[PDB]
Amino acid sequence: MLEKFCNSTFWNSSFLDSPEADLPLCFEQTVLVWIPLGYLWLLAPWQLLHVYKSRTKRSSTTKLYLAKQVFVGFLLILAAIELALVLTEDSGQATVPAVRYTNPSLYLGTWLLVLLIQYSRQWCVQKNSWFLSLFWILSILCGTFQFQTLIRTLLQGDNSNLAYSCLFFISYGFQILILIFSAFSENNESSNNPSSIASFLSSITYSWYDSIILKGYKRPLTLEDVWEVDEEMKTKTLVSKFETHMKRELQKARRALQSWLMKALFKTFYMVLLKSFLLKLVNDIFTFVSPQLLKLLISFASDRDTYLWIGYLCAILLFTAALIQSFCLQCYFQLCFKLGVKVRTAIMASVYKKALTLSNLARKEYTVGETVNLMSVDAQKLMDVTNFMHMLWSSVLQIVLSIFFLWRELGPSVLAGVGVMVLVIPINAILSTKSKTIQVKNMKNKDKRLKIMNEILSGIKILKYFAWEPSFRDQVQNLRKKELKNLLAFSQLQCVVIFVFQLTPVLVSVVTFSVYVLVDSNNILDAQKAFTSITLFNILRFPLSMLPMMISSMLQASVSTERLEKYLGGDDLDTSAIRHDCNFDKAMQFSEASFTWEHDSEATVRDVNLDIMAGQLVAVIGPVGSGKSSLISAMLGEMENVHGHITIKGTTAYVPQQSWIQNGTIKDNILFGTEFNEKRYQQVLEACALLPDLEMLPGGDLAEIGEKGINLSGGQKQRISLARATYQNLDIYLLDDPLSAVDAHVGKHIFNKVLGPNGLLKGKTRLLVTHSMHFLPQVDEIVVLGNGTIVEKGSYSALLAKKGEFAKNLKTFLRHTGPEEEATVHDGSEEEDDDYGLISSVEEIPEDAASITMRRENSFRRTLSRSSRSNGRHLKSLRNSLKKFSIYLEYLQAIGLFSIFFIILAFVMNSVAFIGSNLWLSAWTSDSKIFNSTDYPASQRDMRVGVYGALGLAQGIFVFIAHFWSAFGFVHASNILHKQLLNNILRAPMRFFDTTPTGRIVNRFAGDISTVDDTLPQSLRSWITCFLGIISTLVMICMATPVFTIIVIPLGIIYVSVQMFYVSTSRQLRRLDSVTRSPIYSHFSETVSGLPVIRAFEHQQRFLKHNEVRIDTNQKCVFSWITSNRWLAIRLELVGNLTVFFSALMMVIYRDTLSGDTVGFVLSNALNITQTLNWLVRMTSEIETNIVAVERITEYTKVENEAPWVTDKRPPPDWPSKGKIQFNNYQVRYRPELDLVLRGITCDIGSMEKIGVVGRTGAGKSSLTNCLFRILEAAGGQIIIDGVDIASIGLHDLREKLTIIPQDPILFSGSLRMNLDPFNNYSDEEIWKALELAHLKSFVASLQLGLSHEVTEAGGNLSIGQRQLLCLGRALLRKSKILVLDEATAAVDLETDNLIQTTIQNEFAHCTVITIAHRLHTIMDSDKVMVLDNGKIIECGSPEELLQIPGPFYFMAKEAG
């Protein structure tokens, strides 16, 4: 056939098996040419059909496009001229071969298609494509054999066919220029993201992403510098696609009632997974093509007769094997994890949509925490199962295929070797469940220290008054003792679990080799049959060592997925009872509607019938719990129907009993996403009397409101909530108790200006439900609700004339009273820090994946423990009155320097046994060539395994002492680190606490300490063991080939530059990731608090729009660091591959002296470089991130300090004896940059003198008390007490002798007794004596547990007056000579105030009392009165002396009666 076609042979082994293997000619230009030619003409319709489907506008012709187009035009000229010569040469009566002129014809036709495709390539978004990029690269490789064939023939003094060669030479020359130009990608200015613009070669090598990383290396990143993620991954598009199949599956699920979500995703995403399933096989096949190539290459160096060319081909094929394997692998991770974010984006938005539509009956079971738990953890769990769908089938594929290779290779002895691998899993199982048992048991102890520390932080000042800090310092330290005892057992578990994982590849190598050489047979070992095996086990572990992990994960996902089904599959609210009419004569009407909360429960509203005209003012009243708040719920549609219907017209405005507020500004909340109209905006503020309050607020209307309005008083929240309703200008207004929390005068103002017959809402229908009675005469009609039914209705005069139950209840509760509340503080805290980032999937980097598995559970448990609280903050505006190398060095300083320098020695001395084992094993394999069959002595040639076993156990003992010893260092470091914080922040000045909101201190003492002893300890063991493994293997490569160490330098510099750029960018994206994720959780928690409000204004669509862009703002960055993470392996395995691919050439070209065994180790473990060298940078990323916790620890542990608690000049034990107080020109300031609040007070307090202090607010009255106890240190002047200066005495030598009754009663969680006597210095009868004196004996005895009764947080289980009375018992307990009162009766009823006051003159007559009170009559009994204004004393005299003088005290007394 082809013999006559070429007048030459097809191919023969004679041409092959030669020292210079020359590929037969005719086979070249007839077979290999048919590969790219056949590649084009078959798939050519597929591309043009695909392009013709999507026709667009043509793009501008860049000079680059003209360049690659005309170059192909030259190729046609190339085809033209060469076709001409063969026809002319045929005139010489020579029968030219058919291939000579048929080859151009094929080229002639095919290049026109290239012109056609290139010309048509303009319209597509992608200026290049795989169908072209692969064609050029395939043509070069498939034309390379022709290239080397032509050159060698012509070099041997042959120029007969020179014309064909040179034209072909330049023909090959132009093809490569096409590729180097086609691979280049031009920006068409169409899309911000180069993802749709980058050429195919850039799409794999990720050269397009260099823009971000290069930009990141210059200046800190920002949200706008990260592009929005394409058009496909738009959350709205994702939601619509998923929900279509979701509802269909739900409908079929309903039919089964006479579980689906995992099926639903497959029905929708089967296209995406296929692109990875077909690709994952290509990966696995090329993982095993290397060890097969090892056997060929190792055998090459065994004997000398091998042709030189086989070595180079093996080396080159080794190179391309990795590149194909590398490209698909990263094209797999990037595609698979793109699904990982894709799936979560669907459910996270989908659950939000279902949230606004669920029936409240379903919500009656879930709290606020449970609903957000779906996205906090349950949605997050759906990534990990999704992050490995292909791994469930891949893992079983590798293990069985690996067995087949080794079983065919090594023999039926590895069953024990793979057998011991199987038996590893039971150890991993038992240790894992033991670890889980103790860590969850550690949480209960962990949260206790957190809760205990919340209450001390809130009331640090109160502790400073009495100096209880040593008691709490030992209390927390004692609690920390139970922390480490559980922790050490946990850490001792982790060193064992990493032991079995790390040791097993060595152990199996010992067992597998020992058995084969020692079975009763003539068994020989050599390099080729040994070194291929060890590579297989390196491949084998990862699919097998992770096998228990996904099984746990699948069960872990099983509980999570079911919770989603019960939520999403839950029913929706039934709005059929609510009828919306546009022509109904009334605003609203009842039609015998009976409503019940639960279908099995009784009806809360029974057969009630009303009818309200449009624009009327109607009042609905009734006893508490009669169903008043329930009737309004019927209007909202949240109330279930039994029978009847309701007709409502127009938009409705609603205000709940408990005000719901959003996060933002006051202007934003009232605006509610509408349009700002200033004239209405000013009118509504005046009408709702918000003007006096915004003036009080420092930021005015633009002031940021705290979460749930903690920055705002409860009474105000009702006013803004009502003000929000007024701005909307709706039709129906429902006013569920809008005036109870406001003042009577303000209630008069809001009614007249908004609600009354002169209000802004005169023309609108208004339904008010109120508890007050004075506004009813101004109401058009009054309805009374009784027992869920209406009793009487009519006008105020008619109901009064009827003498009904309203008249009976008219005389009773004429007024209802109710004071106001004050709150003017801000909360600054952040708890969004994580420890799992940078790793989306376990298979990303599997060297030691046991570490990352614990991180997922560690992060899940801490985010599940959402229970956290504070106590209070009275009126502080911001802080005002008037209410790299060295850090790790320090870290390792905490670790015992003795231990740290030997555990590192153990790791390095672990490696020498590792490297010796491989070294000496190579010498063992030399036995095969030097010994004939049955020539080895059975004893002295089998003693080798004894050495291997000894070094095998050396691999264990060396690292057993390493990991186990590191456990002690880690727990010891955590102890000394934790002591440093408690020894300082407790000792830290309160001025530091003044400028620092408690939120930072809470998270720093909790979040940072949590990771430093849990996450960081596991990551360090990871980092050294990989680095030393790398150093061990290259230091072995260098001794085998000394030339290698020279070529390391170019590889070293490129590597360190790459890792520098990534850590300079990947570090920032994590912080940006955290700051955008928390609003999503915050937003959901924000809206779920106010669902009944949302359907009232029908703004459902706006929130979906609002959430749709917020989640996009988040997921646009998580996708942006996945590519950066993928950016490594492509640009770093090309470093890993060259350091192993180059090795092959040096061994090949040094074959004249190396042996067969020598090339084994230098190349065997060299295949472990790629998958482990990249593991190094991944750890380096986390270390540079998680160390910021230690950064933040160092900042707080170096803060300032007060004077020592105890000084050398201790006071006499009886001191104070008289309680005399002397002030001399005393000046202080809150901060050095702030002005002097106190301005030189000089006063003398006689013994046994009662002094009351009066003055305006913030006149230093509270400051002076702080000065007495030395909270604010002396800026100038001094205080002398009983002839002794307090400056020279320590704080703990003076604070025990003085007593204060604080205005704010902060109490300590625990028993009653510890709240009174934490030091246990007094007996129970003395405590009982104090309680009866404080008049608490009846109440405390009434408690079931008596003096041991538990105290809730901030004393939430006790009333305000009791807490004043309880702290009064503290003063009676101490019996200090000096007593100070500072607004102790602000929130005390007059009865208890008299009781509190009575306890003063009787039990404190023999003590000096300083009283500060806004209540003047409480000071009339004081012997002396101090008037403090603007930091100075103005008047000094007795109350009767000051009353006669017309001064500020007389004026204040005039104001107070």
Curated annotation (Swiss-Prot):
Domain ABC transmembrane type-1: 273-556, 900-1185
Effect upon mutating residue 1175 to Y: Fails to transport methotrexate; reduces leukotriene C4 transport. Does not affect estradiol glucuronide transport
EC number: 7.6.2.-, 7.6.2.2, 7.6.2.3
Keyword Phosphoprotein (UniProt): yes
Tissue: Expressed by polarized cells in liver, kidney and intestine. The highest expression is found in liver. Expressed in small intestine.
Sites bearing Phosphoserine, chain numbering: 829, 877, 881, 1359
Single GO biological process annotation from the record: xenobiotic transmembrane transport
Reaction catalyzed: ATP + H2O + xenobioticSide 1 = ADP + phosphate + xenobioticSide 2; an S-substituted glutathione(in) + ATP + H2O = an S-substituted glutathione(out) + ADP + phosphate + H(+); taurolithocholate 3-sulfate(in) + ATP + H2O = taurolithocholate 3-sulfate(out) + ADP + phosphate + H(+); leukotriene C4(in) + ATP + H2O = leukotriene C4(out) + ADP + phosphate + H(+)
Family note: Belongs to the ABC transporter superfamily. ABCC family. Conjugate transporter (TC 3.A.1.208) subfamily.
NCBIfam families: MRP_assoc_pro
Function: ATP-dependent transporter of the ATP-binding cassette (ABC) family that binds and hydrolyzes ATP to enable active transport of various substrates including many drugs, toxicants and endogenous compound across cell membranes. Transports a wide variety of conjugated organic anions such as sulfate-, glucuronide- and glutathione (GSH)-conjugates of endo- and xenobiotics substrates. Mediates hepatobiliary excretion of mono- and bis-glucuronidated bilirubin molecules and therefore play an important role in bilirubin detoxification.
The protein, known as: ATP-binding cassette sub-family C member 2
Lineage: Eukaryota, Metazoa, Chordata, Craniata, Vertebrata
Gene it is expressed from: ABCC2
